[PDB]
């Protein structure tokens, strides 16, 4: 026999190992492949498809309705529709969206984010809002003004439905942690910053016509974004074995 | 009847340096999500940009990758020395719900088998014993006992192993009659049937059953078995909505209403 | 990284003993992203 | 025109020695394993006396005697060689050599009319064990020249299925089709030759599957003949003449 | 020594495993191979020999006589003769012919089936029977004309005794399971489908001739069929030891 | 003499498209079966048939991978440290059932041993032991008892193990004096003798016997010991009708007559 | 199915102790489906 | 160190086994061979006697 | 019977480690059998 010496490790069950092993069925041959449409080779092609931000997670919305963002017809200038931080990992409205259940998969992530917000009042109704990042620092910003220094797009309401705030990069380190748990790993550390929305003038419609609207909020990444180290998604769990 | 290609990336996109744009020509920021396509928008053209020769990897999202490490998929104790298991991955959410994130994929599987034994209180013992895994494919008959004909094994593959040797391991390849394992099936087992316990389950996932026994009689005590799969050798099909509820079943993927995924916050305009 | 060099070597008969693929690229996603017949440039309005 | 049309003709003559049998009504011919007789290879062989090679004193067609199909007919066998272990010059030589090589060519005969109806199964079975009893009777493993009468047909006399034996070589005597089957044998043995006084490697088997039946008085003595022949045969260890 | 790193695996015993192992006698010459007749092998070359189907499998019947469908002279038209299912894995007619057994031996099946007739009456005793398949999807056809809807052969009895039908593979996956056991597995997904034979005209026969006739009925695997999964038989079995 | 050829194929037979056919002179529905050849109707002859190209393969099936796998062969514990088991596969009805599929066959073998340490009332200990196995041919003595002379085993093949390490396991090749073994004899075993005890059984099928101890006493236990065997490149002659009745004895193919093999059904009209 | 390339090297002297044979193909079955003398086409009658 | 995986047969002591194994005295040289009469290769030689 | 190709490397520095010999073969048994200075051919009468 060939001398050998084993060494520590030996006889290890590492979950992510990657050996050869015999197989049970040494000589079987399986089906063809056959054509099947929609082949995926990697989850970056699912999180680069958008899908609804559940936005509106206050008490007195329930099931679809907390899809909606809430916008009417103002009697003052300046006013906020909504807020929210850009972090995809985090628990909040991103959590049950495509990119949010995927970047919960993992434990670090980088890249840039489309937000795209579609809006559903009638074609009479018109409206001007400015959506705005605010890159990390402080706190949210508190008016129009200030949000408006930072990355911001001014959205008209017209014949093409939709807008798109791209809520670049923008950030120390080449990724970033997808928690912001504080209390254990004080990973507060990586707050991406925060996207706004805000009336640039108003939402204006017709007379008799419903004074409320609603727009609506989509996410996805871009494709210079990109997740590292696999985990357990923090919302799959069970008491005993089921039945 | 491809027409829309799928060319391969190692790394993610650059970002190359633009400048100011005032034209009422280009409006990269103008959508229209009703058409069904997400948004083209580029980082470029919605902001003045810096060149960033991004060498960031792929390679963690990749099915492989995603896919390639064991998880629990069984988990018993033998009863009068011996345990019936029917394959299958509902029992355990974990791997369960990761599956369910693909329509059709077609797989190889490790299998890796930890035992150990415990006595009637459920106290792990430091006892070695020999164990026995048997494969039987739907038709052939099952062991009624520990000491059973059929642990004779001469046609259904069997791994015979000890709690005080590292844990059993063995590949199986793509077994299913179908030419890729499906993980949403929305029809019924079988013809002239349309009961609700016979729909949703596609029979061609079910290879089968892993009947355990210790070769020998154990005194008092029992056979503590964990079985883990790790898929390999990935090919995968139309990626599926997440769950986003919990399981409540192992056959079914009934769940319970809810009126929110999220935890609620005082208002829409505070973050 | 992964080493541009290292053993790749079967020692079974099946394929299914084999260790895990190695290729882990990624692929367009406009099956999925934006799978429209007409096409709809970045610079243009979407709809006319 | 038969190999021109691609079909077989119902006649058939088969020559060997100083015997000729003829047939207006067969169903082709069954070679076994397709595979005629053939001589011993310098390569196969261990034995290293010359052998006898007896030619047409032996190779030639021996007709055992008859068995009538019966109403409560189960069916009849045959081993071989013992059949015809004391008939002529083949069964001399059988016995005067401790080992024999040898293949057949059985013709097995029955005739009825266009009035009767029945089918039997014709095979030629290698190593067919007669174990249906605990201690089987030597009058049953080895019968001789008469045969014996089948007493377990469904399961063959040996534990397996009547209905499965079709993956012997055989052919089938139908009334209405034929009225004789015609196969070819080679030697089988996991050895190249062996003892023809202690080891029977075919058993002829003629099991009715159809039971026999006809026009309401027609004839009724139906018999069944069977004609064997020992074909490329050569002996080994001469001595006196020994028998079972 | 050599380092090395012993895996998951180690020390167990695989019954399909396909290791290299030590000699008892490493310098054994065995004896040569010698011409014998009918080498085998692929136990394929063995499903493909036709063998009898137990297809008369009621009370009435014992031993040899299962093996004859009964034919009788008519008073009525259409009738029908004889009915079975075609997977050749299950317990019925089927699980004692050659084909049977094997496919007992795997779990899975795929292929074209051979059934062979053939007639066993008279010269004089004339007649004309179709014989169809019937794909899945329902239950077995109630009259000839549902039957003849599926594929099928109209068989005239004559000079050839027998006629073939052939039972195409149909199936929507490449394979079938070998059971159809449903308590547990539900694979009465993978049923095959039914094959019956009807009276096409009648039995005729002269003055007092047997006015009932027999047919035998034949089985194989056509040229295009395999089988995968190997398996225990289910038919070989015992208590103790035997002595 | 071989007038019939044997191809080599790899997969099954693709099918071809075909199209009707009204005609008097192709008939390939009509057969003989009486010709004692099987049907050589096609699908494409029966019926209109598309293209399809079949890569199904056919490993499986083939000698190799039919009986390429370990199955019991002998099990038995020991008494006064001693056990004589006589090498036969008789007494374990699935690996003997499949070896009678084939009237002649060559074949090497690998034998695994599996041992472990049970005591009086059959309960398995953790008690690491050595044992011996010893092959002893026909002709040597057989040791009487556990010390015996003939466990120095200087030229018969032993193989000392322990309970303690994985399963033992040496390969044997094709040892028969005849140029395959035979899994049917109709013959008996010698001259001068038709006694119904000395038929169907061929003698070189028997190679002789394993003898087991253990190398020193074991107070109050025993040994229990299991052999599997695993047939290796096989070569097989004249395929057999299969066993279709119950086995009842270890060294004869006596069975209890039977009026029917499948279970009978209401009526042969009704599927 | 099975590797294109694996290693195939004999570590024992006697073959008895070599891995399973790797063939497994299957060959034309006539010998024992079609054990005529005559041959029978499948577009004729069997029997003139 | 190279990944393995150990089979049955582990730490067996077959009596007819053929390994190569650490020599006692690895650096020892034996006397010469020296010309003697009557070398026997194979029994086979003695039973022809 | 034997392999024609196998693994012949030695791992040990004393030939004494080395495993056992493959040769096997018989000579000519003259030496034991017939040992005589005469030649006494098979066909003519040994002695004169
Ligand atoms: C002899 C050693 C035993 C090892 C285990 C062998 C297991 C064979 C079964 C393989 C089937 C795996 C695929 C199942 C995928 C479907 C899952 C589901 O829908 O529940
Ligand atoms: C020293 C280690 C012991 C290992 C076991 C060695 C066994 C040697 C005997 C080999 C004979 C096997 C072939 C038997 C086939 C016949 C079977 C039967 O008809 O019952
Ligand atoms: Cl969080
Ligand atoms: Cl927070
Ligand atoms: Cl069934
Ligand atoms: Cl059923
Ligand atoms: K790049
Ligand atoms: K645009
Ligand atoms: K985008
Ligand atoms: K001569
Ligand atoms: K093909
Ligand atoms: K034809
Ligand atoms: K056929």
Redesign the interface.
């Known amino acids: 026999?060939?001398?050998?010496?084993?060494?520590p490790?030996?006889?290890?069950?590492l979950?992510?190992?990657?050996?050869?092993?015999?197989?049970?069925?040494?000589?079987?041959?399986?089906?063809?492949?056959?054509d099947?449409?929609?082949?995926?080779?990697?989850?970056?092609?699912?999180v680069?498809?958008?899908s609804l931000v559940?936005?509106?997670?206050?008490?007195s919305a329930?099931?679809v309705a907390?899809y909606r963002?809430?916008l009417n017809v103002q009697d003052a200038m300046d006013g906020?529709?909504?807020?929210?931080?850009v972090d995809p990992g985090i628990?909040?409205?991103?959590?049950?969206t495509?990119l949010g259940?995927?970047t919960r998969?993992?434990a670090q992530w980088?890249?840039?984010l489309?937000f795209?917000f579609?809006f559903c009042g009638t074609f009479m109704t018109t409206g001007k809002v400015i959506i705005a990042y605010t890159p990390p620092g402080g706190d949210?910003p508190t008016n129009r003004r200030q949000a408006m220094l930072g990355?911001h797009?001014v959205?008209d309401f017209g014949?093409?439905?939709?807008?798109?705030?791209?809520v670049?990069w923008i950030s120390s380190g080449?990724f970033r942690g997808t928690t912001l748990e504080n209390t254990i790993y004080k990973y507060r550390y990586y707050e991406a910053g925060?996207i706004?929305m805000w009336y640039q003038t108003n939402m204006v419609v017709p007379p008799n016509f419903p004074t409320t609207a609603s727009i609506?909020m989509?996410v996805?990444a871009?494709?210079?974004?990109?997740?590292?180290?696999?985990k357990?998604?923090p919302?799959?769990?069970?008491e005993g074995?089921?039945? | 009847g491809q027409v829309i290609k799928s060319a391969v990336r190692s790394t993610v996109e650059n970002t190359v340096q633009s400048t100011h744009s005032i034209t009422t020509e280009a409006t990269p920021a103008l959508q229209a999500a009703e058409t069904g396509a997400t948004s083209n928008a580029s980082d470029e053209s919605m902001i003045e940009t810096r060149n960033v020769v991004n060498t960031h990897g792929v390679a963690e999202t990749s099915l492989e990758a995603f896919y390639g490490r064991a998880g629990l998929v069984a988990m018993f104790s033998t009863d009068g020395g011996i345990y019936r298991w029917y394959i299958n991955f509902g029992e355990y959410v974990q791997l369960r719900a990761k599956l369910e994130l693909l329509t059709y994929a077609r797989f190889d599987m490790e299998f890796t088998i930890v035992a150990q034994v415990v006595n009637a209180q459920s106290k792990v013992q430091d006892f070695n014993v020999d164990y026995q895994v048997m494969f039987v494919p739907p038709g052939a008959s099952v062991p009624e006992n520990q000491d059973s004909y059929q642990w004779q094994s001469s046609c259904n593959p069997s791994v015979i192993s000890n709690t005080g040797l590292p844990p059993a391991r063995v590949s199986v390849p793509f077994m299913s009659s179908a030419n890729a394992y499906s993980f949403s099936y929305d029809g019924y087992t079988q013809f002239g049937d349309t009961s609700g316990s016979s729909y949703g389950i596609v029979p061609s996932n079910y290879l089968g059953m892993l009947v355990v026994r210790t070769c020998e009689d154990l005194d008092g005590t029992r056979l503590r078995v964990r079985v883990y799969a790790k898929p390999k050798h990935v090919k995968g099909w139309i990626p599926r909505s997440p769950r986003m509820t919990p399981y409540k079943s192992r056959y079914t993927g009934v769940y319970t209403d809810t009126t929110k995924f999220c935890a609620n916050r005082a208002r829409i305009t505070t973050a | 990284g992964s080493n541009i060099h290292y053993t790749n070597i079967n020692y079974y008969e099946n394929a299914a003993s084999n260790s895990l693929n190695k290729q882990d690229f990624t692929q367009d996603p406009e099956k999925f992203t934006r799978p429209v017949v007409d096409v709809m440039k970045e610079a243009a309005v979407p709809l006319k | 025109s038969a190999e021109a049309c691609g079909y077989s003709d119902r006649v058939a003559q088969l020559t060997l020695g100083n015997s000729t049998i003829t047939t207006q009504e067969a169903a082709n011919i069954v070679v076994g394993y397709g595979r005629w007789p053939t001589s011993l290879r310098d390569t196969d062989a261990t034995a290293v006396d010359k052998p006898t090679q007896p030619g047409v004193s032996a190779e030639r067609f021996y007709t055992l005697p008859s068995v009538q199909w019966t109403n409560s007919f189960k069916g009849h066998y045959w081993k071989l060689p013992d059949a015809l272990s004391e008939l002529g010059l083949f069964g001399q030589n059988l016995q005067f050599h401790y080992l024999y090589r040898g293949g057949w060519v059985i013709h097995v005969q029955c005739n009825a009319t266009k009035f009767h109806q029945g089918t039997l199964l014709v095979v030629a079975t290698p190593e067919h064990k007669i174990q249906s009893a605990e201690s089987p009777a030597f009058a049953r493993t080895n019968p001789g020249e008469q045969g014996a009468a089948y007493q377990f047909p469904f399961t063959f006399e040996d534990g397996t299925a009547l209905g499965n034996a079709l993956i012997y070589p055989h052919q089938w005597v139908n009334l209405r089709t034929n009225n004789s089957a015609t196969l070819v044998l080679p030697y089988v043995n996991a050895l190249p030759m062996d003892s023809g006084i202690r080891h029977n490697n075919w058993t002829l088997s003629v099991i009715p599957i159809v039971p026999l039946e006809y026009a309401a008085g027609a004839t009724t003595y139906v018999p069944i003949t069977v004609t064997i022949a020992p074909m490329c045969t050569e002996y080994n260890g001469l001595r006196a003449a020994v028998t079972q």
């Open positions: 026999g060939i001398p050998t010496l084993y060494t490790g030996s006889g290890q069950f979950t992510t190992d990657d050996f050869q092993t015999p197989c049970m069925l040494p000589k079987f041959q399986p089906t063809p492949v056959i099947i449409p929609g082949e995926v080779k990697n989850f970056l092609e699912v680069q498809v958008e559940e936005i509106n997670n206050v008490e329930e099931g907390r963002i809430p906020q529709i909504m807020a929210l931080r628990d909040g409205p991103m959590q049950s495509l259940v995927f998969y993992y980088s890249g840039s489309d795209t579609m949210q990355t797009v959205w014949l093409q439905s939709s807008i798109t705030l791209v670049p080449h925060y706004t609506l989509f996805a871009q494709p210079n974004f990109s997740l590292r180290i696999l357990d998604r919302d799959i769990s069970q074995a089921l039945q």
